Amino acid sequence: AHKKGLGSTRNGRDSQAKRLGVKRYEGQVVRAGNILVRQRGTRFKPGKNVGMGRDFTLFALVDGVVEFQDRGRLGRYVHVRPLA
Amino acid sequence: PKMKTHKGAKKRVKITASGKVVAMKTGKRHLNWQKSGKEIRQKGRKFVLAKPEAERIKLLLPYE
Amino acid sequence: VRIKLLLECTECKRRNYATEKNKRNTPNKLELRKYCPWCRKHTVHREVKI
Amino acid sequence: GRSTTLMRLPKRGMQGQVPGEIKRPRYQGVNLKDLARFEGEVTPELLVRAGLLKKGYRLKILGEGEAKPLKVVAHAFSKSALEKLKAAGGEPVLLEA
RNA sequence: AACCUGGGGAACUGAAACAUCUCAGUACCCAGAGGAGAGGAAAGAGAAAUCGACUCCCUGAGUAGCGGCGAGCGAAAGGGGA
RNA sequence: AGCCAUGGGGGAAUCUGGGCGGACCACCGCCUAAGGCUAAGUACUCCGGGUGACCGAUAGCGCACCAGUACCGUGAGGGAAA
RNA sequence: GGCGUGCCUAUUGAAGCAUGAGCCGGCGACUCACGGUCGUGGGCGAGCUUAAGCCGUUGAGGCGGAGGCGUAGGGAAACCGAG
RNA sequence: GUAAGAGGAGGUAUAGGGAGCGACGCUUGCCCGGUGCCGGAAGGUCAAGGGGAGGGGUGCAAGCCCCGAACCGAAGCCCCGG
RNA sequence: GGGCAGUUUGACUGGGGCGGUCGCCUCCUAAAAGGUAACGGAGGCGCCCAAAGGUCCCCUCAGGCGGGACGGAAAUCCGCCGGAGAGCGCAAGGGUAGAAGGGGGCCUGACUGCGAGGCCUGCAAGCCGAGCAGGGGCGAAAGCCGGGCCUAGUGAACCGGUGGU
């Protein structure tokens, strides 16, 4: 067989991925305190009774429904409007 | 003959009066300092389910 | 690390508590911060113990 | 390997010293809607011949029930079961005189 | 033949490891007594001014405690009876 | 960590003497230690008599029978067939 | 003449140049005790049932409530009490 | 050998046990830093013990019970040299 | 005190041993949700700030050329230009000047009793939070405050130390 000086490495380390994305979209009701956007930076700025927490994360604040927005010179918006 | 109720379980469990095994919150001792009061009172009472089958099945004899 | 260590704050006017940390290295003599105890409203709070 | 969920902490306060247990009076409660069923008088030694109580040292009236005048007979009595007893009934405390 | 009292008294095995704990104060070694053995009248029990040698059964009770609070081991009092 | 039991050392008293009621102290009870004997109720089956939703010569006791026989090993012991 | 890779165990997968078996007979392996537990067959029903024992029988049953289960839970505990 | 006692040995440092080498001829150099071993009446650390300044429970108190410093308590390891 | 007794003496793993490795966070492999293996690639965490925290008043950079005693590629100031290449402790990724960055004033919400309803997930644990209520800081107000721009800085239980009830 013969197997001279081989070796090893150092890269056997991969951080556990955490479930990251958006949870509730428009057309979907959310009733007060239901997270809907998991993000790192502000990929999705809040708005109309949308709420962000201590880690960039959008959640329900009204018992209503989501919808979207694109304000280039301001960012990307999410708005959870309920009913009258 | 007679089974044997579990000492440990008994002396650390709260199976409710409805076949529900619901114990106490775990993770409070050498902790506390750089931690939210949130974490303090949320390490109060607990819950749990599923393996509580085995818990009930172990309670037994005086049930409890 | 024990240099920043770990201490706690009690009220004057008999006992009371609240959970905190320190930093002896940094210009940290003693501390009389201002918090709330279990009883009544906000008051003093004195530094003590490990 | 892991503690078979034994990771759950204990809360059984005063779970045991060594001189056995403290000899205290254990009471016994009874729904006074069960009381509404029968009529006459309810002594300790009587109600255990019936189907409740069973040598339960002391009796505390409690539960829901109806405004029926009778001679309840016991030791202590629930404050909220004492409000159904105002509607009608007699109240004897601690027994012997 | 087996049971019975006392003196010596393990290990596997369990705790999926292994000492502490288990198995067990069991197997076996020794001593001796007898149709029984042993036990036996309270320096007890236990909380009530409550009972009244000893062995036996059931219940109390897998209760109360014991415990690297794990394995698991596991009382007497009271009660009904012999 | 009481109580019971005690191997070494110290070392009492006689009814205001004294053990215990689970550190220990007060009290209030409880029982009278450091001498001995006691049947029966319980256990056991070499033994005999009765019974069976027990086996029917590989099952059944190891052995239905000339079995603790042949024969195997020095030996303690093993253990047939029929 | 058409066709046709033994049986088992184990394998991703085997006829196997993997294993087990010469052949036939008989023996031979998921039980039981107590507790627990889901149901299910009935009787009773806010009630249910007795263990030891005692009596009777010669396969004859019967007394025997001591106890266990049930009517209430919450809390570590005191205690509160349909809260 | 738990022990009584046994061998040693009714032998006595030219005698008895243990180790390395292995006739005889030549010869056997440096290191006491780690360690083992020899000794060394100052000393550090440390045991039960001895001691009692000082604290507490409890009784009205007499008292009883527990906690316990100073400081004296070995072997030993450290220390010192060979 | 191995002289003798009973026991420990990890696992992975292109056969095992040596070497390396074990958990936490980032970026690929990861095939536009999630997620997705390897002794597959690339680096980081066991700490820091009582101000680097919390509110109110406020400013905006790195750089480019031109101009100047020391300075002079680059200490400093000035002119004009300059939409994030600066900074935001620490690795990278996300993000950010309509602030999270940088200066000052008062302070101390690294608050209590709770928590609707969601993330995530085998369990466990971890993540997020409106509002309620006590009272508290600042703010003219509107209002924010259950530490830090966010993801690493962490250890269920059994044992007990210490203050209290």
Annotate D8-40 with three-state secondary structure: CCCCCCCCCCCCCCCCCCCCCEEEHHHHHHCCC
CA distance linking residue B42 with residue A46, whole number of Å:
28
CA distance linking residue D72 with residue D84, whole number of Å:
12
Residue pair A67/A26 in contact (Cβ under 8 Å)? The answer is yes
Residue pair D64/D58 in contact (Cβ under 8 Å)? The answer is no
State phi, psi for D44 to the nearest 5 degrees.
Answer: -55, -55
Query: CA distances (Å), D26 to each of A17, D46, D56, D72, in order?
Result: 56, 18, 7, 19
The bases of strand F with some atom under 7 A from any protein CB are 1, 22
Question: I97 C1' – A10 CA distance, angstroms?
Answer: 40
Q: Across the interface, do D8 and B26 touch by the CB < 8 Å criterion?
A: yes
Q: Residues 3-22 of A near strand I (Cβ < 7 Å)?
A: 3, 6-21
**Beta strands in chain B, from DSSP E residues, in sequence order:** none
Please report residues of D whose CB lies closer than 8 A to that of B25: 9
Taking alpha carbons only, the member of A72, A80, A74, A36 closest to residue A56 is A36
Neighbours of chain C (3+ CB pairs under 8 A): B
CA distance linking residue B50 with residue B43, whole number of Å:
21
CA distance linking residue A67 with residue B27, whole number of Å:
40
Tell me the helix, strand and coil percentages in chain A, rounded to 5. 0, 30, 70
Work out if A43's Cβ lies within 7 angstroms of strand I. Answer: yes
CA distance linking residue B10 with residue B63, whole number of Å:
10
Header resolution in angstroms: 4.0
CA distance D21 to chain B (A): 15
D and B interact (at least 3 Cβ pairs within 8 A): yes
Residue pair A37/A78 in contact (Cβ under 8 Å)? The answer is yes
Chain Cα centroid distance, residue D92: 15
Question: Considering Cα of D9, then D13, then D15, then D16, what sign does the dihedral take?
Answer: positive
What is the SS3 assignment for C18-43?
Answer: CECCCCCCCCCCCCCCCCCCCCCCCC
Which amino acid makes up residue C3? I
Residue pair A59/A43 in contact (Cβ under 8 Å)? The answer is no
Our CA dihedral for D70, D73, D75, D77, rounded to 10 degrees, sits at -20
Tokens of A71: 């304000």
Contacts of D44 (CB under 8 A, 6+ apart): D53, D56, D59, D73, D74
Residue pair C7/C21 in contact (Cβ under 8 Å)? The answer is yes
Tokens of D57: 């040292």
CA distance linking residue B62 with residue B60, whole number of Å:
6
Taking alpha carbons only, the member of A67, A46, A48 closest to residue A58 is A46
Residue pair C21/C5 in contact (Cβ under 8 Å)? The answer is yes
CA distance linking residue C21 with residue C44, whole number of Å:
17
Closest CA in chain C for residue B35? C19
Burial string for D11-24 (b: 16+ CB within 10 Å, else e) reads eeeeeeeeeeeeee
CA distance linking residue D41 with residue C50, whole number of Å:
64
State phi, psi for C25 to the nearest 5 degrees.
Answer: -55, -60
Q: Across the interface, do D6 and B8 touch by the CB < 8 Å criterion?
A: yes
Chain Cα centroid distance, residue A37: 4
Question: I19 C1' – A14 CA distance, angstroms?
Answer: 22
Please report residues of B whose CB lies closer than 8 A to that of C9: none
Work out if D18's Cβ lies within 7 angstroms of strand F. Answer: yes
CA distance linking residue D55 with residue D76, whole number of Å:
15
Question: Considering Cα of B43, then B44, then B50, then B52, what sign does the dihedral take?
Answer: positive
Taking alpha carbons only, the member of A48, A69, A58, A70 closest to residue A22 is A58
D41-42/D71-72 β-pairing: parallel
Residue pair A31/A41 in contact (Cβ under 8 Å)? The answer is no
CA distance B35 to chain C (A): 8
The bases of strand G with some atom under 7 A from any protein CB are 33-37, 46-47, 67, 69-83
CA distance linking residue C9 with residue A80, whole number of Å:
43
Closest CA in chain C for residue B39? C19
Q: Across the interface, do B11 and D5 touch by the CB < 8 Å criterion?
A: no
Closest CA in chain B for residue C50? B33
Neighbouring-strand partners of residue A78: A68
